[PDB]
Design a protein around this motif. Sequence first.
Motif, short mmCIF file in Angstrom:
data_model
loop_
_atom_site.label_atom_id
_atom_site.label_comp_id
_atom_site.label_asym_id
_atom_site.label_seq_id
_atom_site.Cartn_x
_atom_site.Cartn_y
_atom_site.Cartn_z
N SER A 44 4.36 11.01 6.55
CA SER A 44 5.37 11.54 5.63
C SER A 44 6.06 12.79 6.17
N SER A 45 5.44 13.50 7.10
CA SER A 45 5.95 14.79 7.55
C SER A 45 6.58 14.77 8.94
N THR A 46 6.56 13.64 9.64
CA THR A 46 7.11 13.58 10.99
C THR A 46 8.27 12.60 11.03
N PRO A 47 9.47 13.03 11.41
CA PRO A 47 10.59 12.09 11.51
C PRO A 47 10.48 11.12 12.68
N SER A 52 0.84 -1.18 0.00
CA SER A 52 0.00 0.00 0.00
C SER A 52 0.88 1.24 0.00
N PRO A 53 0.34 2.41 -0.40
CA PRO A 53 1.12 3.65 -0.29
C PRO A 53 1.57 3.96 1.13
N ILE A 54 0.71 3.68 2.12
CA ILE A 54 1.08 3.88 3.52
C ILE A 54 2.19 2.90 3.90
N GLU A 55 2.06 1.63 3.49
CA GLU A 55 3.07 0.62 3.81
C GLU A 55 4.38 0.92 3.10
N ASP A 56 4.30 1.42 1.86
CA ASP A 56 5.49 1.79 1.11
C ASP A 56 6.21 2.94 1.80
N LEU A 57 5.44 3.91 2.30
CA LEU A 57 6.01 5.04 3.02
C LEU A 57 6.65 4.57 4.33
N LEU A 58 6.01 3.60 5.00
CA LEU A 58 6.54 3.06 6.25
C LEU A 58 7.86 2.34 6.01
N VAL A 65 11.89 3.70 7.45
CA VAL A 65 12.63 2.92 8.43
C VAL A 65 13.94 2.49 7.78
N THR A 66 15.05 2.91 8.38
CA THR A 66 16.37 2.61 7.83
C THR A 66 17.20 1.78 8.82
#
Lengths: 50, 170, 106
Positions: B167-170, B72-78, B82-83
């Motif tokens: 997307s906007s909060t580190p 999902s776009p949310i899962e892709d962003l998640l 995470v590094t």
Amino acid sequence: YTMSLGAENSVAYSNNSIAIPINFTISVTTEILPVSMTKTSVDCTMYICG
Amino acid sequence: DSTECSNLLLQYGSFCTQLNRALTGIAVEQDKNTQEVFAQVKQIYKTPPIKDFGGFNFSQILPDPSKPSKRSPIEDLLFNKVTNGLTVLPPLLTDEMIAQYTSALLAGTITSGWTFGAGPALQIPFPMQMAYRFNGIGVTQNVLYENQKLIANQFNSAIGKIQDSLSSTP
Amino acid sequence: FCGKGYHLMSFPQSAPHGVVFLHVTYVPAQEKNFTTAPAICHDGKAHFPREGVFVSNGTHWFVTQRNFYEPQIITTHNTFVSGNCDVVIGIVNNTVYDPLQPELDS
Ligand SMILES: *[C@@H]1O[C@H](CO)[C@@H](O[C@@H]2O[C@H](CO)[C@@H](O)[C@H](O)[C@H]2NC(C)=O)[C@H](O)[C@H]1NC(C)=O
Ligand SMILES: *[C@@H]1O[C@H](CO)[C@@H](O[C@@H]2O[C@H](CO)[C@@H](O)[C@H](O)[C@H]2NC(C)=O)[C@H](O)[C@H]1NC(C)=O
Ligand SMILES: *[C@@H]1O[C@H](CO)[C@@H](O[C@@H]2O[C@H](CO)[C@@H](O)[C@H](O)[C@H]2NC(C)=O)[C@H](O)[C@H]1NC(C)=O
Ligand SMILES: *[C@@H]1O[C@H](CO)[C@@H](O[C@@H]2O[C@H](CO)[C@@H](O)[C@H](O)[C@H]2NC(C)=O)[C@H](O)[C@H]1NC(C)=O
Ligand SMILES: *[C@@H]1O[C@H](CO)[C@@H](O[C@@H]2O[C@H](CO)[C@@H](O)[C@H](O)[C@H]2NC(C)=O)[C@H](O)[C@H]1NC(C)=O
Ligand SMILES: *[C@@H]1O[C@H](CO)[C@@H](O)[C@H](O)[C@H]1NC(C)=O
């Protein structure tokens, strides 16, 4: 092999159809939970030194 | 690779066996944890091709066909956000299969409500399911039906705000 | 939490250093498709199910409990009225029986 997550089941979704059960199964399942362990005591002086 | 060091290490006994056994237990425990959390359905449910849910938009949480990872776009962003004797064992469930499990759970909860978690998946329209959920918290069905467009718009806006906030909060 | 399915009851059994719970649960089976509607339009009023759901077997509309198929006649005791038929999306036209109607009729 590559493990199969499960059997595919495409639910027939539509905006005006519902599925109603006409029967039921009384299912009894088992759940095993450990509660306690063996109570072991070790004499530190006797273990290390006899 | 020192034979003399291993010979001297054998004077200390089965410490190495204990440490290997403990680490092996942790390693199998991680896979058991992933199975317990994500592998709670034995049926892989799929969403219908037509996303007609009475105004409710699930594009940000359903898997994206355009992405090779099928996330999902949310899962892709998640996933984007995470590094000497040490080995890293791969997990039993890969990321795409975990995503597939989440997709099956999403398809079950969208097309069938809570029926799939208690037995066979029984289809129900999503507004009717939302009305059932409204009744669960003590609000009558009429409130949901009369304000269905407003509720769908608020839900879509909240999902978009969730994606923006992640997307906007580190 | 207490077995797969809708939990009915549980029975404890002792085990060596442990407990075994026999979870008695209710599992739905033999489901059937029905045509459903959010509300019933009668006399310019919208009727919604009090505790059940509106189902149709093809020609007639009934109200039934969600977890078992038990069709009943759509009366004025099993439903409630909120608003007219112009707001609810997908409302269908069907008659709503009145129990009091044969009494003043006779
Ligand atoms: C309710 O109706 C739908 C479609 O009218 C049924 O879904 C079909 O089921 C058959 C039997 O396995 C499949 O071969 C078709 O591919 C399904 N079609 C779709 C679009 O999903 C569904 O089985 C019916 N439900 C019941 C309980 O009979
Ligand atoms: C609901 O399911 C039960 C079984 O789970 C059905 O009972 C069976 O009925 C058949 C014929 O009617 C008998 O030959 C079996 O011996 C029965 N089994 C048991 C365990 O009683 C029951 O008929 C079903 N009811 C409906 C309405 O479908
Ligand atoms: C559901 O939401 C998605 C995005 O939240 C919508 O996709 C947008 O569609 C408009 C016009 O169709 C485009 O200008 C946007 O760029 C799209 N956004 C993305 C992220 O692709 C979609 O239209 C909504 N509705 C449905 C029915 O899917
Ligand atoms: C839907 O259910 C209703 C009620 O069970 C059915 O109406 C009855 O059908 C039987 C079968 O011929 C008749 O003997 C009765 O006289 C009917 N009752 C009334 C009040 O008319 C109806 O036929 C069902 N529809 C379908 C398509 O199965
Ligand atoms: C349900 O009944 C209402 C009223 O009996 C129908 O509304 C009428 O629809 C026709 C055709 O569009 C209009 O010319 C009338 O002016 C409407 N009357 C009212 C009071 O709104 C409605 O169309 C019916 N719905 C169905 C699906 O049969
Ligand atoms: C359901 O979808 C059909 C088209 O597939 C449409 O004609 C009908 O009005 C819709 N009903 C509701 C309640 O959205």
